[PDB]
Amino acid sequence: VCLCPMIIGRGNDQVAISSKFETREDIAVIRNYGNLLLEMSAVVPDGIVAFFTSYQYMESTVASWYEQGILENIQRNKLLFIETQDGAETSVALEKYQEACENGRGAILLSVARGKVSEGIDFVHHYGRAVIMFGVPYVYTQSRILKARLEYLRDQFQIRENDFLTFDAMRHAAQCVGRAIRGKTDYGLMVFADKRFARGDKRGKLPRWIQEHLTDANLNLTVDEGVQVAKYFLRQMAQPFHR
List residues binding DNA (CB under 7 A): 18, 20-22, 138, 141, 162, 165, 195-196, 199-201
Nearer to DNA, 47 or 135 (CB): 135
CB of 25 to DNA, least distance (A): 10
Tell me how many helices (H) and strands (E) the chain has.
10, 6
Task: Please report, to the nearest 10 degrees, the dihedral formed by the alpha carbons of residues 227, 231, 233, 237 taken in order.
Answer: 150
DSSP states of 132-178 as a string? Answer: EE-S------GGGTHHHHHHHHHHHS---HHHHHHHHHHHHHHHHHG
Backbone angles phi, psi at 167, to 5 degrees: -65, -45
CB of 137 to DNA, least distance (A): 12
CB of 91 to DNA, least distance (A): 34
Nearer to DNA, 141 or 175 (CB): 141
Nearer to DNA, 21 or 209 (CB): 21
Nearer to DNA, 111 or 166 (CB): 166
Round to whole Å and give the CA distance between 109 and 120.
14
DSSP states of 182-203 as a string? Answer: -SSS--EEEEEE-GGGGSHHHH
Nearer to DNA, 69 or 200 (CB): 200
**Amino acid letter, 34:** G
CB of 94 to DNA, least distance (A): 32
